[PDB]
Amino acid sequence: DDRDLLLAPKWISFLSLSSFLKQKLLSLLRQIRELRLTTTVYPPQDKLMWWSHCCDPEDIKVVILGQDPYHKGQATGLAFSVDPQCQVPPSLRSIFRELEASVPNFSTPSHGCLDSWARQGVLLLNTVLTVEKGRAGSHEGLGWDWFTSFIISSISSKLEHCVFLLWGRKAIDRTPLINAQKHLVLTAQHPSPLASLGGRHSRWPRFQGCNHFNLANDYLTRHRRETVDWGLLE
Amino acid sequence: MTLELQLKHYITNLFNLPKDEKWECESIEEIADDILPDQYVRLGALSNKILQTYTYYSDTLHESNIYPFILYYQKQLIAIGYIDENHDMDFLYLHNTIMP
Numbered sequence: 036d037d038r039d040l041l042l043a044p045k046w047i048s049f050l051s052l053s054s055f056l057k058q059k060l061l062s063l064l065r066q067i068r069e070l071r072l073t074t075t076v077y078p079p080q081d082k083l084m085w086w087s088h089c090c091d092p093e094d095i096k097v098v099i100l101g102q103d104p105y106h107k108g109q110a111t112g113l114a115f116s117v118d119p120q121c122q123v124p125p126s127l128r129s130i131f132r133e134l135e136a137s138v139p140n141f142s143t144p145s146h147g148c149l150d151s152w153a154r155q156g157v158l159l160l161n162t163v164l165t166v167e168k169g170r171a172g173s174h175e176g177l178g179w180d181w182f183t184s185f186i187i188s189s190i191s192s193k194l195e196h197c198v199f200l201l202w203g204r205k206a207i208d209r210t211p212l213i214n215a216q217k218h219l220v221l222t223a224q225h226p227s228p229l230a231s232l233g234g235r236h237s238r239w240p241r242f243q244g245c246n247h248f249n250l251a252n253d254y255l256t257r258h259r260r261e262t263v264d265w266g267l268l269e
Numbered sequence: 270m271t272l273e274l275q276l277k278h279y280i281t282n283l284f285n286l287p288k289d290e291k292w293e294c295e296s297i298e299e300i301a302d303d304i305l306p307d308q309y310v311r312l313g314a315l316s317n318k319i320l321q322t323y324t325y326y327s328d329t330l331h332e333s334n335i336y337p338f339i340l341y342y343q344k345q346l347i348a349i350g351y352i353d354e355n356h357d358m359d360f361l362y363l364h365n366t367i368m369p
Contacts, residue, residue, distance in 0.1 A: 107294055124295040125324045125336055171296030171321060204300045204319065227295075228336045229322050230303040232358050236310065237303040 039064070041084045049092035050189050063178055067165055075168035078110040083164050085112025089153035095190055096156035096263055097198045097251045100206040103163040106171045114159035116149035123147040129226040129242060134265050137246045144268035151267040160186060162205065187212045196258035198251035202226055202242065219254040221247045272339060276325070276349055279361055280337045292325045292337075304340065305348065306358070313364065318342060 037047050040060060052060065067083070070076050078085070101114025105124070109117040115127045123131065127147045134141045149159055162183045167173040187209055190197060197218045201207045203225030213220050223245040224230045224237050231243060252262035273294070281288050299322060301315035310316055321341040330337070333354065340348035349362035350369075360369035 102298055103296075106296055109293070109295075122293060122326060122328070122331075124293070125326050126295060126297060128326075128331075171323070172298065203297070204303075205298050224303055225297060225299050227297045227299065227322065227324060228352050228356075229297070229324060229338055229340075229358075230299055232304075232352065232356060234306055235303055236307045239303075 041080070041087075043084070043087040043091065045091045045093070046084070046087040049193065050185065052185075056185070059178075060182055063182070066177065070167070076174075077104045077106060077108060077166050077168060078112045082110070082112030086153055086158055086160060089113070089150060090156050090158075092190070092194065094156040095158050095194060095197055096255055096260060097200060098158045098160060098187070098190060099200045100187075100202070100209055101159060101161040102203075102205050103172055103174065104161055104166045106166045106169055106173075108168070110166070111148070111150075113149055113153055114161045115147075116153075116159055117147040119146040119148045121147065125228050126226045129228060129231065131268075133226070133243055133245065134248055136243070137249050138265055141266040146269065149268070151269075152263070152265070155263050155267070157263055158190070162209065184209065184212055191218060196255070196260055198254050200247045200251065203230070207239070219251065221245070221250055223247060272346075272349070273323075273325070276337050276339060276361070280330075280335070280351055284333060284335065286329050286333065290327050290329055292327050292330070295324045295326065297322050297324070301342070301347075309363070309366070315342065315347070320347060 040047055067076055099114055104110035109121050109124065111118055117124060131143045135143050153159060160183060163174055163179045165174045191213045195217050199213050199218055199220045201210060201220060201222045207222055210220060223240045224242050226242045248265050255262050277292055298319050301310045301318050301320050304320055304322065323339045325337040336352040338350060347364050348360055350358060350360040353359050363369040
């Protein structure tokens with residue numbers, strides 16, 4: 036019965052959801068199926084928990100929060116990532132450029148598939164796991180927030196010495212869920228080009244030059260954990 | 270869709286880009302304080318308010334270093350424009366702004 040949660044086995048063990056929360060997640064999945072019957076929902080069912088199949092909770096090193104999936108078919112189940120056939124979207128392009136500028140060995144890839152990051156323990160978790168085709172934020176009220184917040188809280192409380200990369204107001208809203216005494220929380224503006232302009236009044240550092248990836252690797256090494264090879268993108 | 274096609278028409282004519290090229294869209298929610306000019310955010314009562322942003326991208330848009338965008342505040346159209354080659358925000362439309 037637990038396999039209906041679509042999560043990998045070790046993830047089901049790690050989260051250790053109560054019967055009530057398991058039923059809540061199953062009801063949400065049935066809602067998604069009933070919506071798929073009449074509308075297109077991104078990503079596919081087998082991709083909602085793609086992050087759980089790309090790596091186990093014991094391998095989590097860096098947690099990068101997204102918002103809702105791409106609403107025009109680019110979504111893969113991971114945050115920011117796109118299929119190897121699709122163009123690199125602007126936010127992911129800015130992420131790749133910051134990597135190019137800050138990491139020496141890194142070279143910008145020709146695609147935006149981040150499955151290699153996910154296999155290394157980079158959790159690219161959207162805070163809302165589904166979206167209706169062509170309608171951004173259409174699933175804001177479905178009820179994905181409790182589940183993704185539960186994942187973040189479980190990583191915070193049951194794991195130690197992870198790095199959380201919170202970009203933009205929506206991702207930073209999840210700061211209270213993370214124990215900043217057990218984990219490193221790096222905060223910056225959203226990587227979108229719309230937030231990179233001068234003459235604004237942001238409260239967080241600019242994304243270009245935030246150096247979050249090198250800082251995350253430094254934190255991981257300082258706590259005797261393997262670093263993330265950000266350059267593996269092909 | 271109609272506003273997207275208007276933005277596409279305007280940009281492709283303004284920068285002499287291919288009219289038939291397919292545009293894709295990335296949508297991101299962010300507070301107006303990080304997106305729009307400072308004094309505009311203050312005078313427009315947009316401080317600490319979430320904007321639904323739409324950024325459009327393509328091959329020629331990438332080669333031109335241009336990011337066309339449309340900004341909404343809930344159901345209110347806020348801005349239509351583009352980030353130019355010099356990383357500046359140029360506005361086709363800005364709410365309650367003449368000649369932005």
